[PDB]
Amino acid sequence: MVDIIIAEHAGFCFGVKRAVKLAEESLKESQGKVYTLGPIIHNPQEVNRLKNLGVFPSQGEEFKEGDTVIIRSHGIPPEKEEALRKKGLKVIDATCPYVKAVHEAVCQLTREGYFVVLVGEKNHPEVIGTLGYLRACNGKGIVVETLEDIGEALKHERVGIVAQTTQNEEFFKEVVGEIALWVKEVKVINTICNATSLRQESVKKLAPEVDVMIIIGGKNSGNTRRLYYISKELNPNTYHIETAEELQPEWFRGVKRVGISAGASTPDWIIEQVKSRIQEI
């Protein structure tokens, strides 16, 4: 009956959790120095935590033969991964399985004879990686970041459409419907990942079943704010905090249940410091 519960999918998404796990496990039996190919995520504290364990964020090309290099969740072009192996590095591929699914999808579409449209941000490392995969399987295509970008694809009778894993649904729906009006045949493989949905649906499920909701994340964190607001409309008894320091004793008078979730940038140890600060109250 009685419960103080952490919402499933709280904090880091699947891919990042897995990348962190892979990094940590690489330290066991590492004969050389262990590097991530740049910082493993944009969270300085977590990058710092990993550095303290011996997982170093690479600056350039400083790793040498026998060192371990971990490919980030966004992946890299296949020829770059190959170049790293050729240097004698032990390569740990932490590319997100959802990202790998995009790699596979652009190759599938090429085999099926489609000109490929990748809906996403041109300069993004994930997109650059996927273009490398498209190239390697002898595919052709373009990145569509705004509606103006679709012109080249409209020259083709058969267009295959995929998404950057973090592509906004609204623009994706718009691109797909617009291209469909102009060309003979369109095939869409929806490669948008389910991370944000998973986190948010889980909060919607928990919030009406607890007395108070703690939503952890940066004050100015956009996605934590969304989580807060989703929780808020179901449970007016909802607090958005950054660290266990804010958990005020008075908030838990007469509560039998406490729900916790956290924004995409919050590591599990911060979620844990909050849990233990509450179990005290």
Q: Contact with ligand F3S (CB under 6 A): which of 99, 109, 116, 175?
A: 99
The answer to whether 146 contacts a second copy (rule: CB under 8 A) is no
Q: Is the sign of the CA dihedral 154, 165, 37, 78 positive or negative? A: negative
Give the strands of the sheet with 212-216, arranged side by side: 3-6, 257-262, 212-216, 238-241
Phi, psi of 97 (to 5 degrees): -50, -35
How many residues make contact with ligand F3S (CB under 6 A)?
12
Q: In whole angstroms, what is the distance from residue 209 CA to residue 235 CA?
A: 9
* Catalytic position from the list 81, 126, 178, 209: 126
The answer to whether 184 contacts a second copy (rule: CB under 8 A) is yes
232-254 burial string, b = 16+ CB within 10 Å, else e?
Answer: bebbeebbbbbebeebeeebbee
Query: Is 9 among the annotated ligand-binding positions?
Result: no
How many residues make contact with a second copy (CB under 8 A)?
18
Query: Is 265 among the annotated ligand-binding positions?
Result: yes
Beta strands 238-241 and 3-6, pairing class? unpaired
**Would you list the DSSP string of 250-264?**
GGGTT-SEEEEEE-T
Query: Between 182 and 252, whose beta carbon lies closer to a second copy?
Result: 182
The answer to whether 167 contacts ligand F3S (rule: CB under 6 A) is no
Q: Contact with a second copy (CB under 8 A): which of 190, 205, 229, 233?
A: 190
The answer to whether 181 contacts a second copy (rule: CB under 8 A) is yes
Q: In whole angstroms, what is the distance from residue 183 CA to residue 130 CA?
A: 23
The stretch near ligand F3S (CB under 6 A) out of 92-100, 207-215, 218-226, 244-252 is 92-100
Phi, psi of 91 (to 5 degrees): -95, 125
Q: CB burial class (10 A; 0-12, 13-18, 19+) of residue 208?
A: exposed
Catalytic residue status for 126: yes
Query: Is 42 among the annotated ligand-binding positions?
Result: yes
Which helix (H) or strand (E) covers residue 42, if one does? none
The answer to whether 15 contacts ligand F3S (rule: CB under 6 A) is yes
Q: In whole angstroms, what is the distance from residue 181 CA to residue 236 CA?
A: 45
Query: Between 13 and 188, whose beta carbon lies closer to a second copy?
Result: 188
CB of 183 to a second copy, least distance (A): 7
Catalytic center residues: 126
Query: Binding site for dimethylallyl diphosphate: which residues?
Result: 42, 74, 124, 221, 223, 265
Annotated binding-site ranges: 13, 42, 74, 96, 124, 165, 193, 221, 223, 265
Positions touching ligand F3S (CB under 6 A) are: 13-16, 73, 96, 98-99, 165-166, 193, 195
Q: Which residues contribute to the site for a second copy (CB under 8 A)?
A: 169, 172-174, 176-178, 180-181, 183-190, 192
Q: Which residues are annotated as a binding site for [4Fe-4S] cluster?
A: 13, 96, 193
